[PDB]
Amino acid sequence: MPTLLRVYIDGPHGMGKTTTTQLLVALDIVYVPEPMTYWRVLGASETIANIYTTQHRLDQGEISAGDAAVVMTSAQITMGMPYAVTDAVLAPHIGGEAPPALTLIFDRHPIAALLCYPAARYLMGSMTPQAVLAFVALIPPTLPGTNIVLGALPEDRHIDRLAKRQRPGERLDLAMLAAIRRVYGLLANTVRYLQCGGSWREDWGQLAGPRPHIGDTLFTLFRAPELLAPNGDLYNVFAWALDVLAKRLRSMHVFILDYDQSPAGCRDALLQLTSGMVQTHVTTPGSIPTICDLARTFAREMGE
Amino acid sequence: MPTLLRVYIDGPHGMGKTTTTQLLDIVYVPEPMTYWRVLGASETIANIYTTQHRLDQGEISAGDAAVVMTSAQITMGMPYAVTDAVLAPHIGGEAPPALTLIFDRHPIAALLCYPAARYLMGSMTPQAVLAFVALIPPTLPGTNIVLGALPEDRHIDRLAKRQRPGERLDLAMLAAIRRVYGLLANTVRYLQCGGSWREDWGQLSPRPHIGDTLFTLFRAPELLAPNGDLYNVFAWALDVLAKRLRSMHVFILDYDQSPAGCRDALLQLTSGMVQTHVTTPGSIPTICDLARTFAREMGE
Numbered sequence A: 001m002p003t004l005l006r007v008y009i010d011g012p013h014g015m016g017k018t019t020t021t022q023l024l025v026a027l028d029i030v031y032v033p034e035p036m037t038y039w040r041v042l043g044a045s046e047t048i049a050n051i052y053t054t055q056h057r058l059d060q061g062e063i064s065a066g067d068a069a070v071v072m073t074s075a076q077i078t079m080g081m082p083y084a085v086t087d088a089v090l091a092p093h094i095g096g097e098a099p100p101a102l103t104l105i106f107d108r109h110p111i112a113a114l115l116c117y118p119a120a121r122y123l124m125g126s127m128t129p130q131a132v133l134a135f136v137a138l139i140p141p142t143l144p145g146t147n148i149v150l151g152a153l154p155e156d157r158h159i160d161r162l163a164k165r166q167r168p169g170e171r172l173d174l175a176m177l178a179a180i181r182r183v184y185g186l187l188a189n190t191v192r193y194l195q196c197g198g199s200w201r202e203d204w205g206q207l208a209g210p211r212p213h214i215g216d217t218l219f220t221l222f223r224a225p226e227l228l229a230p231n232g233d234l235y236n237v238f239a240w241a242l243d244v245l246a247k248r249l250r251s252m253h254v255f256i257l258d259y260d261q262s263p264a265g266c267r268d269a270l271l272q273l274t275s276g277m278v279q280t281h282v283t284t285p286g287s288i289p290t291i292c293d294l295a296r297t298f299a300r301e302m303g304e
Numbered sequence B: 001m002p003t004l005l006r007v008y009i010d011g012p013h014g015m016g017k018t019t020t021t022q023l024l025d026i027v028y029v030p031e032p033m034t035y036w037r038v039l040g041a042s043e044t045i046a047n048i049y050t051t052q053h054r055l056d057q058g059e060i061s062a063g064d065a066a067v068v069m070t071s072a073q074i075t076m077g078m079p080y081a082v083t084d085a086v087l088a089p090h091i092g093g094e095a096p097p098a099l100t101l102i103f104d105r106h107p108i109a110a111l112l113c114y115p116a117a118r119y120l121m122g123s124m125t126p127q128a129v130l131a132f133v134a135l136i137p138p139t140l141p142g143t144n145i146v147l148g149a150l151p152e153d154r155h156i157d158r159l160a161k162r163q164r165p166g167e168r169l170d171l172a173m174l175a176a177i178r179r180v181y182g183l184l185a186n187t188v189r190y191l192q193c194g195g196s197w198r199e200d201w202g203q204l205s206p207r208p209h210i211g212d213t214l215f216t217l218f219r220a221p222e223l224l225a226p227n228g229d230l231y232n233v234f235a236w237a238l239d240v241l242a243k244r245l246r247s248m249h250v251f252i253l254d255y256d257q258s259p260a261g262c263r264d265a266l267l268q269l270t271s272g273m274v275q276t277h278v279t280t281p282g283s284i285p286t287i288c289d290l291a292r293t294f295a296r297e298m299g300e
């Protein structure tokens, strides 16, 4: 049966993720871009502009935390929509883990919009930890062969790039760059932690390579007073959401790519990471052209 | 492994659902009122009814209401979503049952039905509605949904009897919501009798007419390209909707009767509901403790 290789390139914005994936594809391989047209027009109007303005208004004291949250949560649902439909429509074609007959290079995974940016916004004070856990409860079941490439880039180098790689409506917010950089750092650790045998419930009280300390994983973000019962423990609803988070991330295959290099450098470095990656079979022989066409339609309609 | 029967009592509010289910080897996962009012946010139900009210009075714009409405529906469905998420792994294949779980509403209530009704009320974008649909969890085996039957004036009488803290009798929402659950029941029959929305979509320009299914709501101008074409993103979310709903097992309960009769009728529908196997020996006790803990923490 034919196999498929799926690779999601994720991480904080401003590292050169979209460039190098395109470079990679410029070499039976399809790119699924960020759905900017959905973000700027189809799902709502100028969602990215809406996000950075809200935070700024909040930061300026022009709106309250409750107003920012209402707006952020809503904006986050719009941001993740194309990721979620694509994942759900793709799911029945993914077979068991197995050159690839088709390689799909995605620009971000559903968790970017359902976990990472919400978690970072929570840290920024524009989202509640309860809403983040709601998003987490809705993260779609992790398909076999979910390979995630996260990016690394020194912060000073990132700050300079960030001034550069702005979006229309995006504002230079270093506090946010730091929050999102931290959130993704916690993400990589959580996967290792979970794969090294870590159980958040067993270590809750404590709040490649060896197993990380729970305090160096995403679980640590949820030590908020809002989620704690009068008896000091997490309410079970929130505890159950942490169970889903651990369940979703434990099966992902996470790789780190050094972006502190030239565009062709990142491309060849990614081209090299891509071999130790899990492929999977497809559910029907004709899943390949189907998948191929989904990606192309997605690209053609929402890419921009 | 032992067997389980999951039964989700759903439909518009104000029909007497919670009351008749309480009158029923069987656990009851109640309505998460504590989560709505305290745990996830403060007085979510009040927040919802008040926003619609300000919208209605022109005190706020449709976009302001949509942001609030969307944000709140996330708070409303959280308990259903995690429960489903944590439950999924124990549900085995379809097959007296070792355990009977009676849920007060299914995830689709907060991820499809209320959002759709709110769009019908002008307080939620259809793009938001389709984002929630896209997030509807895969439909596990043995998902039996009991929906209700009750004449409007009789429902109004009941609606009046029990409104949750913060509610405002809104006959236009009663109508929008009864419309949605009516279309829902029609959509399931449609999907089961072989209906293809992609194939029947043009008619909007033995089975229910697509114009009488949930698909008709998404012939919304915001979802269409300049030439009238539905954008693919939205068409794919309709594919998910079709996929999620088709495998559901729907049962209708006539509420136009007494609580014990409603209770009797419900227990009666049980004979045709689909049971499933659990995945582990220990699935039953674990499922039991979840349902009991949920009840304990979130039922007020």
Ligand SMILES: Cc1cn([C@H]2C[C@H](O)[C@@H](CO)O2)c(=O)[nH]c1=O
Pocket (backbone or CB within 6 Å): A013, A034, A048, A051, A076, A079, A080, A108, A112, A113, A114, A117, A167, A170
């Ligand atoms: C995917 C995603 C991106 N973004 C921001 C990061 C960049 O500013 C820009 C494009 O990724 O949008 C969000 O704010 N939320 C999201 O969920």
Ligand SMILES: Cc1cn([C@H]2C[C@H](O)[C@@H](CO)O2)c(=O)[nH]c1=O
Pocket (backbone or CB within 6 Å): B013, B045, B048, B073, B076, B077, B105, B109, B110, B111, B114, B115, B164, B167
């Ligand atoms: C389940 C649900 C209920 N409601 C309302 C209906 C009733 O007012 C109350 C209890 O069902 O909550 C919503 O507004 N949204 C939801 O998603």
